[PDB]
Amino acid sequence: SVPSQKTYQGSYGFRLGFLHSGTAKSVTCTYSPALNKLFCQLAKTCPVQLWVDSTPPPGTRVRAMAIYKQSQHMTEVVRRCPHHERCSDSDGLAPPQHLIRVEGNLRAEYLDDRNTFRHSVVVPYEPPEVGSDCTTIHYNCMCYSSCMGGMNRRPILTIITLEDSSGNLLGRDSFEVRVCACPGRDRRTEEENLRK
Ligand SMILES: [Zn+2]
């Protein structure tokens, strides 16, 4: 009833990577290593890199799930707010309720867990292309952190799990997400407070 968030490289040495986008007022998506926190604008492309030390077997998949970071909310399904689930912005594949979409991948599957009712989205793992050392998935987050009735100003975590063809755990990583109007300013502000 609470998905595990424990970091776990496993046998293939799985871990995430993030681009270095800066904190300019105009940035649509930026990542803070010091806070392990991704700041992005509503429904904007969020590149997430997948890094491994060895290639996992064919049929390996990559799943993304969000949970609330505070323990008192951890048991509540993270979902889109009463407004955004009704704004008819589906891409055909993502259910309107799902906060996290994968962008530009026809093989993305969206899951509604029969037991926990949590949402997740899963894609096949593709090894890196020639001339690349990693694989990138593009994610969208489809509500603001502050959406009333939805995330409701609460911070979330996005958990990325490397899975075999049966859904058994091969690797896990995680990062905090804030969806806000101005990712650059918010990352600067929070990183200033962290030193102080
Ligand atoms: Zn919303």
Residue numbers in the entry: 96 to 291
From the paper:
Here, we have systematically analyzed the structural and stability effects of all oncogenic Tyr-to-Cys mutations (Y126C, Y163C, Y205C, Y220C, Y234C, and Y236C) in the p53 DNA-binding domain (DBD).
The cavity created by the Y236C mutation was significantly larger compared with that induced by the Y234C mutation, which provides a rationale for the much more severe loss in thermal stability upon the Y236C mutation. Interestingly, the sulfur atom of the mutated residue, Cys236, is located almost within the van der Waals distance of the sulfur atoms of Cys135 and Cys141 (distance of 4.1 and 4.7 Å, respectively). Here, ATO had a much more stabilizing effect on Y236C (maximal stabilization by 4.1 ± 1.0 °C) than on Y234C (maximal stabilization by 2.2 ± 0.5 °C). The Y236C mutation is located closer to the ATO site than Y234C, but it also has to be taken into consideration that the Y236C mutant is much more severely destabilized overall by the point mutation. A more recent study on ATO rescue from the same group classified Y126C as partially rescuable and Y236C as not rescuable, in perfect agreement with our stability data showing that the stabilization of the Y236C mutant by ATO is small compared with the overall stability loss upon mutation. However, due to the much higher stability loss in the Y236C mutant, reactivation may be more challenging for this particular mutant, requiring a much higher gain in stability through the action of chemical chaperones than for the Y234C mutant or other mutants for which a ts phenotype and partial reactivation have been shown in cells.
